[PDB]
Amino acid sequence: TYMEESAQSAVDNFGLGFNLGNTLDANGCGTGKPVATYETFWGQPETTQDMMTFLMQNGFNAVRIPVTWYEHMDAEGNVDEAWMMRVKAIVEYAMNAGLYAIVNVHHDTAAGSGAWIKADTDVYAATKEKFKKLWTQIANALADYDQHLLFEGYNEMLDGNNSWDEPQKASGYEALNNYAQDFVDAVRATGGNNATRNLIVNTYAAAKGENVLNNFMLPTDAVNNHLIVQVHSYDPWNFFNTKTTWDSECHNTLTEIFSALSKKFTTIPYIIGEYGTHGESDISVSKSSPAEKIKLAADQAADMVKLAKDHHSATFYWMSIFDGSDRIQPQWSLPTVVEAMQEAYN
Ligand SMILES: [Cl-]
Ligand SMILES: [Cl-]
Known part of the structure; x- marks a missing residue:
């Protein structure tokens, strides 16, 4: 049963x-492939119920499910039924486990080949109906999913030149x-639970610099208290490769981010939809990193x-804590990082 709740409550x-x-x-495998070919194309195992249950039973209450849609769309923008059903199945895994879940539109944005949603006015005009x-x-x-399911309009929208800080x-x-605005309008127009479902809109690049925040305009919504803004944080950029410890500079970098976000967003909640150690060339922590670098991740x-x-x-942690073959056990890839999080939350 759907039980409406404010975005802040969520x-x-x-x-x-x-x-x-x-x-x-x-x-990147092209169109018309078996569903599993996409899901495993970047080395992860196919998702299972036990994975979501493992998350809930081990101290997590929310999962973000990034989804990339373009290879699953025909020329008319219709989504292959088989793909939609698999997205539906993974949502249902999360619902069943009791989790909140977020479904988005992911590498349809940003710097990868095939991205088609861009912070560019010609591109917007050509793609808005699609x-x-x-x-x-x-x-x-x-x-028909309850209030535990949220929709996120788009991931990391960039301009035509893939500018990461701000559009040129x-x-x-x-x-x-x-x-x-179109995302919110399209969802609300379907009515039912979607009339009041909590929805998430992201800033340019999911960044949070002064210009990016100043030029973000929250969509107008016919109902109140049902929008969340999302940003991502891997700051200070590249710290995983340049810092020995999570030090005062690192900490001050984050406190300034939260202070800036709270000051800006006084009428809506915001979330950190991704964070982790991923820095230059996506280099990041793994369970074979030196003990000191794993401590850095934990801190x-x-x-x-x-x-x-x-x-x-x-x-929402980006990947590293629950990765690859560890997901099918299931077990944490980085239990010392998870333990640092659980005890900070509690
Ligand atoms: Cl590609
Ligand atoms: Cl990324």
């Missing part, structure tokens, strides 16, 4: 969150703000979780 209920990354977001048709299908397919042309912000994660809790926000 965020406060997320607790510790996890990104099922490089899974349904994996892409974007609204995509969201209509997603909203209709996922309409200020007009790029118009495109982003218009897509955000970043403890800080992030506590600061987010203090700021009435919530966070």
